[PDB]
Every structure is written in structure tokens, then in C-alpha cells.
Design a protein around this motif. Structure first.
Motif, PDB file in Angstrom:
ATOM      1  N   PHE A  54       1.053  -1.120  -0.081  1.00 20.30           N
ATOM      2  CA  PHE A  54       0.031  -0.037   0.098  1.00 20.30           C
ATOM      3  C   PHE A  54       1.017   1.306  -0.068  1.00 20.30           C
ATOM      4  N   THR A  55       0.285   2.422  -0.568  1.00 18.70           N
ATOM      5  CA  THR A  55       0.956   3.832  -0.676  1.00 18.70           C
ATOM      6  C   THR A  55       0.295   4.624   0.448  1.00 18.70           C
ATOM      7  N   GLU A  57      -0.910   7.854   0.595  1.00 18.50           N
ATOM      8  CA  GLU A  57      -1.244   8.976  -0.447  1.00 18.50           C
ATOM      9  C   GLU A  57      -1.396  10.259   0.480  1.00 18.50           C
ATOM     10  N   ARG A  86      -3.261   3.665  -0.745  1.00 16.36           N
ATOM     11  CA  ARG A  86      -3.738   3.243  -2.193  1.00 16.36           C
ATOM     12  C   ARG A  86      -3.060   2.016  -2.334  1.00 16.36           C
ATOM     13  N   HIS A  87      -3.916   0.949  -2.771  1.00 15.07           N
ATOM     14  CA  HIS A  87      -3.407  -0.407  -3.214  1.00 15.07           C
ATOM     15  C   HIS A  87      -2.690  -0.184  -4.412  1.00 15.07           C
ATOM     16  N   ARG A  91      -4.951  -0.036  -7.501  1.00 16.05           N
ATOM     17  CA  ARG A  91      -5.056   1.248  -7.770  1.00 16.05           C
ATOM     18  C   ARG A  91      -6.137   1.646  -7.021  1.00 16.05           C
ATOM     19  N   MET A  92      -6.795   0.809  -6.343  1.00 16.65           N
ATOM     20  CA  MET A  92      -8.172   1.369  -5.567  1.00 16.65           C
ATOM     21  C   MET A  92      -7.588   1.441  -3.895  1.00 16.65           C
ATOM     22  N   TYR A  93      -8.678   2.262  -3.305  1.00 15.25           N
ATOM     23  CA  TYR A  93      -8.222   2.498  -1.908  1.00 15.25           C
ATOM     24  C   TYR A  93      -8.722   1.718  -0.718  1.00 15.25           C
ATOM     25  N   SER A  95     -10.658   0.847   2.445  1.00 16.21           N
ATOM     26  CA  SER A  95     -11.609   1.372   2.724  1.00 16.21           C
ATOM     27  C   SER A  95     -12.663   0.444   3.621  1.00 16.21           C
ATOM     28  N   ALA A 108     -11.918   7.554  -4.251  1.00 19.77           N
ATOM     29  CA  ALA A 108     -11.233   8.238  -2.966  1.00 19.77           C
ATOM     30  C   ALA A 108     -12.247   9.341  -2.164  1.00 19.77           C
ATOM     31  N   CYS A 113     -12.769   5.749   2.841  1.00 17.16           N
ATOM     32  CA  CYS A 113     -11.378   5.076   2.730  1.00 17.16           C
ATOM     33  C   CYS A 113     -10.487   6.010   3.792  1.00 17.16           C
TER      34      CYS A 113
END
Length: 473
Positions: A54-55, A57, A86-87, A91-93, A95, A108, A113
Motif C-alpha cells: 500500500f502507498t 497517499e 492506495r493499493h 490502484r483502489m483505496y 476502505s 477516494a 477510505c
């Protein structure tokens, strides 16, 4: 030793199942499955790490978060702050999904999330910089509930019970153009690049080759570099440092075997001794940090020899398709160079992998009862995967500008080409052939549960739609 925004992390917790201690990483696929699960590694074999990353953000004060929701660089994380994860693949968050459960979300927008970080002891207080190694509790801003490990099976959810989490760092700022772990790349010879054979080969896709022509543009030639240690695995790679080399679409591991020799191998059989390679500057005879460390290996400019750690054998060729082998001496020209795969291609190879495995599981379920009348199918998963892939191949609107359309079309054709060269058509086709054996849903229910039959007509229509979308244009 503090978490900054734009850093990459995995979320770990700890459990002692079957009188055995295991570290559990939060993981989710995204496409075909929104729900998070726990990728466990105990002390014994390489894990599915790509879907764990995960990142960070953003990290926001509750006042600044409230303003962002009301209205339309590398900050340090402070306790009390809300974060957006962010995965890396999907690319999804991350939540809090209603009906409350934990998984991946497309948008987002909203408070679903966002997660606040709170101290796990009296050692830390609100406004203090969140440190690497700390235990933490995470609270859903949407539901005021705890990111929480559940228990036969070991699940994740959002209940009022607390669970202590580690945000183990993977990577942080790196030197431009340097090879880090977890990168997806191609290894180039001399053009020729390291690969396995195309889908449906007599190989069983177990063998490794040097091959030129159009592979340099195909998924089968992509590899993920995976250092042995999970912490700071996204750090700069160093000459002599042990790593595993994973084939992205197959999910198998470059290996040395007693009987077969240099081949690719199932993850479950990826013993450290068989699976450990390193890059050498040279063929001469021949301390781990906790950071990005020193920059040693440069993309394109660095010529690397690949060595098997346990045997000291060189990655060479037998001797345009050439068979790759491990040899004691190898050849003067064994030096490879490395090129970084860009993200769209990288993402696509992983989707291929997830999709191949899912539909194969579906096909294997069908053969289980073909002859037999009167192992549950991944109906919900197959449906979702289909719909996701349809939207993934969806063509640009005619309303869009002509200039942008050309670029979006070239991308689509390219995505389509990658799935195609990986045997996706045959894969979709086989699902259809198997399902069409049945005249009606009622006929289907005779060999499969009537419950499954409720989605029989839906799956076929969706399969057909995918088929059209893979071919169209």
C-alpha cells in the motif's frame, strides 16, 4: 525512522495459530475480489507480496480532513492523523465497506477510505511522529471502528474489538534509475530477453529461454525481483544480495533443481536454497541495512551476471530461441542488462495472472461434475472478474477528442494484445464450451446446485461480452 507520505508499506499483525507464531499482511486483489484477506508467512516460503503493498497517499489533520470533504510534499505521519492507503496493484483505496467489512474501493471520495492512527501505548501521544516498528490501532473515519483481525479461518473486518498493527515499510524515496526490490522488469541479453514459452506449450511453461523478436513486448518476459527479507524489500538492490526471481503471469519462481536443472517452479516448492539468485559484477571467486541503502545497480547502464547463490552456477545459454541453463563456467557474454517495465504493462501481467487462476479454478469445478448428476464454484468472483475486464477493455467514447482517442485506442489494443498472447481467448472460450454443454439453466442445475444455476445465463452473457471486447478493434 518515521513514515513519510508517498512511502510504500504493508500492514502487519501477529497471531499464534496451531501453537505457531505468524506475521500476517493485509492483502486484496481488487479485480474479481474487493475483500481483504491475510497473506500469512510463518517461520516458511515466499508470499504473494505484490498485492500487499500500500502507498501512503495523504496524512491529514481531522480539521484538514473535514475541510477537504466539505470543499471540492513528503509529510511525516503524526499520531491522530487520518491516512489514505492506495493499493499498489489495483490502484483502489483501502476502505470500510458497508454490509461493516474491509476491502478495496474504486473512489477516494467520502470518508469511507480514511483511517486515523492512534498510539498503542503511553510511549506515544497525539502529534508525535509515527515511527517504524510501532504497534498501532487504526480507526475507520466512516464508521468509527477498528481495523481488526478475526478468528477456524483468519479474517479481517471492522469490529469494535481492537487489533494492533505494524506499518512495516517497503520503500521510500529512491535514486532515479536504480533497481530496487519488488520492481517488475525485463532481463536483456546482447533483442533477446529472458522468458518462458507461450501459453499451451509442450513445456508446461516450466523452461526458461533467451528469445528475440516480439517477446520484449509480451507479458511472458516480465519478472519481479524479490529480496528475501520482507522489511525494506523495496530498497536499492545490491551486488551479491540474495533474491528470488518471480515470473509475473505464471507466479512461479526461477529455480535450480536436482533432476530438471534450471527451471521455473511452483511457489509452494520455492525452497530458499533452490530459489536464491544474485547479481554479480563479475565472475571472480567472491551487513543488511534498514533503509533504501546504497544505490548500486543502474537500469540499462549496468551489466550484471546472474548467479545461483547455493551452487555458484552461472545463468547462461545452451545455444532465435535459446535454452537458458545454469553452468559452472558459462560464457564470456553472459552479462545481462535490465529494463524497467512501465506500470500499465506491469499491472496487466498481474491481472492476467489473477484471471488465469480464477477461470482455471472455475473450469476445474465444471469437470468435477460433468459426468456426475444430482467444491463450490467462484460464481460471485467469476461474475465480478468478467464485469471488471469488460470495463477494462471498454472502448473510448465517441464524444472524446480525436487526438486523445488515438492514444486511448493504442493503449486498448496494447492491453488486448497482452491478454491475447497469454492465451486468454482460449481461456474464455473453454468456459463457454463447458457451460454450453448445458441447454438451459434447469439442465445445468441437474449437475450443479440450483443455486449456481441462478447465475448460469448471466455468466455466459458476460463471457461472450468479454470475448467481443477482447477482439473488438
Amino acid at each position: 525512522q518515521f513514515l513519510r507520505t508517498d512511502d510504500e508499506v504493508v500492514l502487519q499483525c501477529s497471531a499464534t495459530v496451531l501453537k505457531e507464531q505468524l506475521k500476517l499482511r493485509l492483502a486484496a486483489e481488487g479485480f474479481g475480489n474487493r475483500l481483504c484477506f491475510l497473506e500469512p508467512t510463518s517461520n516458511n516460503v515466499p508470499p504473494d507480496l505484490a498485492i500487499c503493498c500500500f502507498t501512503l497517499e495523504q496524512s491529514l489533520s481531522v480539521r484538514a480532513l473535514q475541510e477537504m470533504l466539505a470543499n471540492t510534499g513528503h509529510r511525516t505521519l503524526l499520531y491522530g492523523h487520518a491516512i489514505l492507503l492506495r493499493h499498489a496493484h489495483s490502484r483502489m483505496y483501502l476502505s470500510c465497506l458497508t454490509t461493516f467489512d474491509v476491502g478495496l474501493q474504486e473512489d477516494a471520495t467520502g470518508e469511507a477510505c480514511w483511517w486515523t492512527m492512534h498510539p498503542a501505548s503511553k510511549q506515544r501521544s497525539e502529534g508525535e511522529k509515527v515511527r517504524v516498528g510501532d504497534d498501532l490501532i487504526l480507526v475507520s473515519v466512516s464508521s468509527e471502528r477498528y481495523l481488526h483481525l478475526s478468528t477456524g479461518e483468519l479474517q479481517v473486518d471492522a469490529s469494535f474489538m481492537q487489533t494492533l498493527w505494524n506499518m512495516n515499510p517497503i520503500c521510500s524515496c529512491c535514486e532515479e534509475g536504480y533497481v530496487t526490490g519488488g520492481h517488475v522488469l525485463r532481463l536483456f541479453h546482447g533483442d533477446e530477453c529472458l522468458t518462458i514459452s507461450a501459453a499451451d506449450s509442450d513445456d508446461q511453461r516450466r523452461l526458461v529461454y533467451y528469445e528475440g523478436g516480439a517477446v520484449c513486448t509480451h507479458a511472458r518476459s516480465l519478472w519481479r525481483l524479490e529480496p528475501l527479507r520482507i522489511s525494506w524489500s523495496g530498497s536499492h538492490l545490491r551486488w551479491g544480495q540474495p533474491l528470488r526471481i518471480r515470473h509475473v503471469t505464471t507466479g512461479r519462481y526461477l529455480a535450480l533443481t536436482e533432476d530438471q536443472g534450471l527451471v521455473v517452479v511452483d511457489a509452494c516448492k520455492a525452497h530458499t536454497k533452490a530459489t536464491s539468485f544474485c547479481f554479480r559484477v563479475s565472475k571472480e571467486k567472491l551487513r543488511d541495512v534498514e533503509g533504501m541503502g546504497p544505490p548500486e545497480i543502474k537500469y540499462g547502464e549496468s551489466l550484471c551476471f546472474v548467479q545461483h547463490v547455493a551452487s555458484g552456477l552461472w545463468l547462461t545459454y545452451a545455444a532465435l530461441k535459446k535454452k537458458a541453463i545454469l553452468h559452472q563456467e558459462g560464457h564470456m557474454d553472459d552479462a545481462l542488462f535490465l529494463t524497467r517495465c512501465q506500470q500499465e504493462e506491469s499491472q496487466a501481467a498481474r491481472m492476467i495472472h489473477s484471471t488465469a487462476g480464477l477461470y482455471n479454478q472455475f473450469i476445474k469445478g465444471l469437470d468435477s461434475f460433468s459426468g456426475k448428476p444430482r467444491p463450490a464454484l467462484p460464481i460471485e468472483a467469476v461474475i465480478l472478474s468478467l464485469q471488471d475486464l469488460i470495463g477494462y477493455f471498454e472502448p473510448p467514447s465517441e464524444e472524446l477528442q480525436h487526438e486523445e482517442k488515438q492514444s486511448k485506442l493504442r493503449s486498448l489494443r496494447n492491453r488486448q494484445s497482452l491478454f491475447q498472447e497469454e492465451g486468454m481467448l482460449s481461456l474464455v472460450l473453454n468456459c463457454i464450451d463447458r457451460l454450453n454443454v448445458y441447454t438451459t439453466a434447469a439442465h445445468f442445475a441437474e449437475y450443479a446446485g440450483e443455486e449456481a444455476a441462478e447465475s448460469w445465463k448471466e455468466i455466459v452473457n458476460l463471457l461472450y461480452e468479454l470475448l467481443a471486447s477482447l477482439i473488438r478493434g
